[PDB]
Structure formats: C-alpha cells, structure tokens
Symmetry: D2
Subunit: 261 residues, 4 copies
C-alpha cells in the first residue's frame, strides 16, 4: 500500500532509507508521505517521535515501525540488518498490529489546546517558583511546590519518568503515571512523594496558585504557555499502532536497554 | 443474611462489636462465623487483613467491610460513628460491591504451596546474602543482589511498597508491582532499580543461585521456607469484594492518610 | 557599633525594623548600611540570603543575625518576640560568634568570574540537553547526562540539596555536596547516582561536551552564561559569621523545621 | 619488621600468600601473627574486614594493606601483579601511612559492650516491628518506624550506605552517616528521610519504645542483642592505618568500581 520513510539525516540512515525504497519498488507499494498507511522511522527513538507527531492526525490508519541505526531503541527496536526482511514482510501485508496507550494534555486559557504525547508531558515554571494545586477527579489532592511534574504513558515510563523515580509499566496497561521533580517537603508543605498511576477516565488537573505562566513539554516539544488556567491530563482514547513482525517482548527490551545487550 | 464481626480486642473495638451485634438482632440477620456472607472488621487494617485471611477460601461469597477505631485505614475506612448507619444499610442488603485484585504466590520445593496476598509478598534471605535470578515470562531479566524484593497488589501499594519507592496504583488496575530492597549496583552487578508494574497473566519467577532457604512473607505472615526451587508471582484470578455504602474514593483515601485529615 | 537592618518589606517586618532601630537608639549604636559590623535580617531565609549577598565583600567584618517574621528559618532562626532581648545583647557586644563554610564557584570563558554561595550553586542547560564531563581533582569522574547538577554548602544541604536526595550535613563540617537532577542511566550512559561529599581543597570541575551555554544559579540568582569553558567548585576560604546569643542546635533546627514545632 | 598475611582461602589467594612469604624471606622480615606491624590481606574487602577485626586491639601499631585477587576492592585495592613490588617496598619500610575514621558502637543493657566498625553498624528488629526513638546529643530528634537504620563510616559509605541512598564521603572527613531502611511516613508517623552526616563528638542514641530486642550488625558480624536499653553511635577516637606505596585516589577508586574499569 502507501508508505513513507523518515530518516535521522546522517549518511547511515539516509542510505538505509534509499535502499528500502529501492527494495519496496519490487512490490505493489507506493511512496506517499501525505496519506501513508505505513510509517518507517530510521534512526533513534527521537526520529520515531517526530514521525509519530508528523502524522498524529491519522493514527488510526497507520502502522508504525522503527529501525535503530544507533543503539537499541524502545520504539526503534529493529536492526538495519533486518531491513530487507522488513521490506518483504511489510509488502506482503497481513502482519499483526499492537497498540500502545497515549496521553492527552489539555491546556486552558482565559481558548484551549489539546496535545497527544507518546512519551510524556511535563510542566515547569516560566522562571520563578513552581506551585500548582493538583486535582484528581475534581478533588483537591495536594499543593505541589518543586521543580515541576511529569505525566508519562506506559511506553514513556522508560524515558524521563524513569529518571524521576517512576515505575516501569508494561504498555498493555491503559494508564498514566505522575512523577515529581524535586518537591519541597517540610512541616508546612506536603506532597505525596510517590509516583501515582492513574487508570483510564481519571482526570488529573493542574491549577495555578500565583504565576499563570508555565513551560509545558509534550515529548520533544517545549513551549512557554501564558495565562494558563488549567492543565488537564487523561489517558487518550487514541492509540499508536505498530506493525508486528516477530516477538520482541517489552521486558526483554527493558533488559537489553538497561541490564546488558 | 449470615454475618460475623471480628475485633482488634481492645475495649473500644470489643464494645463496638457487641453494639453492632445488638443492632443486627433487630433484623433478619444471623451471626455465623463459619459461612458468613458479610465480614465486618473492627480495628485497623491489620485487623482487616486477619479477617481476609481467616476467610480467604470463601472470597467469592463474602463482602468485606472495615471500621477503624483508631486512625483511618485503607481497608478499615469507616468511622465508629457510622456503625448504626452501617447496620441498617447492610441489613436491608441491596448494596453495591467493589472488587480489588489479589496477588498469588507459588512456592515450589524439591511439593508446592500457594498463597493469596491482599497487600504484598516479600522474599528475603534466611541469614546470609540474598541473590536470586529474576525471570519474567520465562525470560531471564536480572540477577538481583540486595536485601530482598517485594511484590505488591494495587491496594497494597500504599503499604510496604510505598516505603520502598514504589508507585501508588489505583486498585481498579489489575496488576502487580515489584520493588527492590537495598540493591547493590556496581560495574559487575546490575539491577533495574525502578519499580516494575506487571499486568494480568505475566508470571514473575524468583530462582535461587546459591542458598535455597528464604524468609517469605505474605501480608502479616512470615515463614522461613527451606529448599526452595522457585517463587512465582502473578495477579490472582480471585478478587476481594467490599460492601460499598457511599463514595470514598481511593485518591481521597490516599490524601486523608498521607497529606492531611 | 555600626549596624544595619534589612526587611522583607511587608508591614510586619518593616514595623519590627523600626522598633529595633528605636531600641538601638538607647545605646552606643550607629546605623550604617555602608560599613556595618552587624547585619540584622528581618523576614525569612530569602531575606537573609539577600543580606548576605549585599555584603559578601565584608564577610570577615560582619556578624549576621536573622529574625523570622513568618515560619522558622535555618538562618532566620529567632522569633520577633525576642527582638527586644536581641537589641540589648547585641548592643552590649561581647557575644560569641559561629562560622559556616561557603561554596566558591568559578566560571571560565574564552575572562572568568567567581561567586560565593551560602546555600548552593546549580548548573543546567540553556534549553537543549545537559551533558557535562565531571572532573574531580583533574581526574575524569563521569559524563553526566540529565537535568543538571547542584553543589551545596553544609547549611545549604537543608534547601535544594534535600529535595534532590542529598544528605543533611552539620555545618561544622567543611565540605561541599554534589547532587544529581534526573540523571539518565542505561547500558551506554552511567552516572554515580549517589550524592558526593567533598572536603576542603578538592576541586570539582564541570566541562562542556557540546553546548557551551549554561543556566547557572548561585543561591537566589540565576543567569544564562554563554561560551562557558569550565565551572569549578570548591569550599571557599571565606566563612559567614553569625552572632550567637543562645543555644539553638542545628539538629534541633532540622527537627523543628521538618518533624514538628 | 613483624608481619602476617591472611588469605581468602582459595587456590589463587593461598598461592599468592606463600609467594609473598617466600619473597619476604629475602629481607629482615619476621612472620608473626600475634604482634605484627604489617597486616596483608589477600582476597577481597571481606577478607580485609576480617583482618581488621582480627587485630582491632592493636590498630595503632599496624599498617594494613589489601590485595584483590578478584575484582577491585575499596580496601583491597592492589593487583596480584604488584605483589613482588609490594614486598620490596614494605620490606625497606619508610613508607607513608594514611588513616581512615572508624565508628564506635556502644550497646547498653539492664552491662554494656563496645564495637569498632570499619564499614557500618546496622540495627533492625528481632522479628516484629522496628520502632526506636532517635536522640542526637541528648535531644529527641524523631521516632523511627521502618526496617532499620544504618550508621556508616566515610570509607563505609560505598557499601551498605550506598544501597540505602546515602552520600559517598571522602574518607578524610571525620564523620558518620545515618541512613534509613524503608521508613514509614504518613500523617501520624514522621521521619527525616534524608541521610544525616554527623561530625566528631556528636552522639546518636537509639532508644527502644516497645520491644527491647534488636538484631545489631557491625561490618560482617550480626548478633541478636536482648534487653537493650540504648545503642550509641559516635566517630571513634581510633583510626585504621594503611601503608601507602603509590597514589590511588578515593574518587578514582569510586570511578573504577562504579563507572568503568
Ligand atoms: N532517556 N533516554 N533515552 C532517549 C530515548 N528515548 C526516547 Br526519545 N523515548 C524513549 C522511551 N519511550 N523509552 C526510553 N528511552 C527513550
Ligand atoms: N504501613 N503502614 N501502615 C499500616 C496499615 N497498613 C496495612 Br496493615 N495495610 C495497608 C495498606 N494496604 N495501605 C496502607 N497502609 C496499610
Ligand atoms: N526549600 N525551602 N525553603 C526555603 C527556605 N530556605 C532558604 Br531561602 N535557604 C534554606 C536553607 N539553607 N535550608 C532550608 N531552607 C532554606
Ligand atoms: N556492597 N558491596 N560490595 C562488597 C565489598 N565491600 C565491602 Br565488604 N566493604 C566495602 C566498602 N567499604 N565499600 C564498597 N564495597 C565494599
């Protein structure tokens, strides 16, 4: 069917892309980067994230596949030496697909904006102190003072969330995980400390107390938002779909990446 | 129907128990501690855990309810001042029920034994060093050296798991969470560090490397097991059922217990 | 002798300042904010930090004293109700003095700039990823990737350093403590993880790998430094001197602030 | 002078010991394991700890030296290939010496017993819950509930203390560091959380609240003490002395052990 290939841009990735395209030309496959049904990322997980966000409006019509030309990735989890075998099995079609949960972020002002994150969304202050009221399902949970907060997807738990002390969650669990950055705790200020794992349909709301300006990140992209009234997090109804061509279990991927490979 | 009441044993709890029994005698309610359909715990979460384990073979025929005569509990989450209202609404019946996941622990020797945990199960060494191989779905994940390991239920995440750095998980998520106790990490020994959240049907196996003797705990109970060949953890197919008589959200319960009340 | 009083600027602090000045006028005491020998801070620890930095060039000729008009401070550790007793004992003189270590920060470019910190100095990236080589006494220790790093004084260990997992150090120990902010660790990237306590004369150097632009903080002040070649940390040869008028042990101050008061 | 060599007991260590003894016989050196002035440990840091404790009553008359026949140690920090060079330079004498602080532990009953630790001393409960009152310089600091506590020397900070989140301290700092094991913290129970670094002459006292029986460890040795009234920790007045024959900086030793070698 229709497909496209994105590259990290170095010689290795660019030349691997041209060789899969050449390989694909031996099949009933059309290169189309406007309405593809297969998106191949060649590079690292950062290349994959840009591919995901490039096409985040046609997520239900696309199966993603990532090839790592550097170290192993959690999304770019196939080796360049399998490019030829990848071309053949993608061309034949009839491959199985796997879906990962996504994180929806809503930002409201005094209109509103929504974003999809594949890894995580983080909130920090614009320059001064960071204080927000944390509201879970319309109930006030805590007044957070610290460097910021991070809301992770399950597949995102191995990224920023891991550096902040969060748990690693198998991505078949539809959930989101909130971690703290450098919270201050004393006799007058109190945060939960522990990461928090929220299921589908639970809404976590961040509401300002003094400053209304926040640096908000979604995956790689970070933008200063001004006059913010609320930041809402919930597990998205949308999912990212991967082409599955063999078994590479999440826990094995965790092992290869953090234990030894 | 049939019901029983367990007490922590101090004057407060014993006298509250006699007064609910007296209140129950004004209804079509029979005291039966052999085959009850309602189990009322009066005391703390430790009293509730003993009630759960006293009847863990009739879990599907029992709705549990806990009253805290001391500080607020995560299972004993109703006040003594609501005992009278509790008697009336339990007697009428037609109350809603909520179910929490449980943790199954299997211990194999050279027969085997299974246990249900409501909070967590922990493994430590019998006296010397603790080293186990950690196997996830038959794939070797890591060689753990440290003080021990802990596998938590979702409702258990607010107990030992929280003291070890684990995440707090809403109990509607069918999962288990593995946390490390004082792992040694250097250039030659390597553990993941992060807590690990596993879904239903994932099997986590602990296999000895040298010493085969382990101190294994399940909730309050801890026993030295000898000549152990394997410890297997998985989310149980069984659930604990609570009588629900009003709204007391898990996150509110977390807030009241760790933030302020 | 000569003295000055700085205020946080709210009614409480401003009126307490005017009343100590009035009290001081009953003694051989001259108000001089150019060359004082006593600096009184009225407000919180943030007011005290500004006082310290206002006079950081005459540190050896000044004894500092802090009054907290809000919650208890680690530097502003005396109550407004003791202002009258403070005036009398400072005026008589012949009080004992206590000295706390300070942190020297050197920033080199392609000239150089030095700073004194009473609490801590932190380094973070200007916008992109933060990577520095960490060099201890001219030996390469690690390549740090993460959000940033923080170097604390002993009295500073109860501030940002505490939020990052560092140890609390009694301020009679001449040392500095380096803590990590959200380090990434995997099979290819490796940091020590643990806080690091360095003695006098040990030099810790931060050297850039790619980006040469850093956001560098010293206590309350944070400035983007451009074309940085090196950041050097060492325990300063200078100390901050406090007027001591009764016993308020550091550990008691830690207890009152974080346990209960 | 007089000297002795202890071995881990495997072929490698036993044969290296016999070859240094043979090498020493070419000099004015006498083997004496009763009153040696040089103690050579061949094996790992565990072999070194047993050597230290074997002679802990003649610490001021002994210079220790450790050889690692396995991986690098923090005390056994010389390679077997340097045994021949070690024999020659020890025999000539006139080597420099370095001293590390030690931890004194006092246990009082209803007599009393004192111990020296080179790494750390830990207190845990005998079987039930662990609760102690923590007293610093006769002032009540906190009521600790958890798995236990650990008091580390500076050179010990790279051992158990590191696994518990403590800081790594250069051993030229005369201090001790208290870390928590799995403390419970809620709205009713409160610990400091952070590691605590204490200077010389500060006394940290552990006093029981309910159970008076404790499992107390000092380095490798762990003994159940019964009817304990107090456990006192302070930096010892005694030090361990090493023979120094070249430069192997502590931070380099930390790097080789935890970063790469
Ligand atoms: N941190 N780090 N390494 C960068 C690669 N990285 C990205 Br980009 N996304 C992920 C992810 N989901 N899990 C683990 N590493 C990831
Ligand atoms: N730790 N502590 N406090 C004892 C009470 N405790 C018990 Br017993 N079970 C739980 C639970 N599931 N969550 C939170 N606290 C609990
Ligand atoms: N974080 N917080 N609270 C602000 C007050 N704060 C300041 Br400003 N300096 C210190 C210090 N040295 N120790 C503890 N708190 C401090
Ligand atoms: N943990 N671990 N590894 C055992 C070796 N070990 C001993 Br025994 N003593 C020390 C020490 N002082 N520092 C670092 N490792 C040490």
């Amino acid at each position: 069917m229709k497909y496209m290939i994105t590259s990290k841009g170095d010689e290795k990735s660019d030349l691997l892309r041209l060789n899969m395209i050449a390989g694909f030309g031996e099949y009933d496959m059309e290169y189309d980067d406007v309405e593809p049904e297969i998106v191949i990322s060649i590079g690292g997980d950062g290349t994959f994230l840009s591919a995901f966000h490039q096409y985040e409006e046609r997520l239900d019509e696309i199966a993603f596949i990532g090839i790592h030309t550097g170290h192993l990735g959690f999304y770019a989890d196939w080796r360049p030496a399998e490019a030829d075998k990848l071309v053949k099995l993608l061309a034949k079609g009839e491959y199985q697909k796997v879906s990962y949960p996504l994180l929806k972020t809503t930002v409201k002002y005094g209109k509103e904006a929504t974003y999809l994150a594949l890894n995580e969304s983080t909130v920090k202050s614009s320059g001064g102190p960071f204080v927000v009221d944390v509201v879970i399902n319309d109930i006030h949970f805590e007044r957070f003072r610290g460097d910021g907060l991070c809301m992770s997807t399950p597949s995102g738990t191995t990224a920023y969330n891991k550096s902040l002390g969060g748990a690693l969650m198998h991505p078949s669990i539809e959930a989101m995980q909130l971690t703290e950055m450098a919270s201050i705790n004393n006799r007058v200020y109190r945060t939960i400390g522990s990461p928090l794992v929220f299921p589908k349909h639970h809404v976590v709301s961040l509401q300002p107390v003094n400053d209304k300006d926040f640096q908000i990140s979604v995956d790689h992209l970070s933008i200063l938002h001004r006059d913010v009234q609320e930041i809402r997090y919930e597990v998205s109804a949308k999912k990212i779909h991967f082409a599955r061509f063999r078994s590479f279990p999440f826990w094995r991927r965790v092992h290869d990446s953090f234990i030894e490979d």
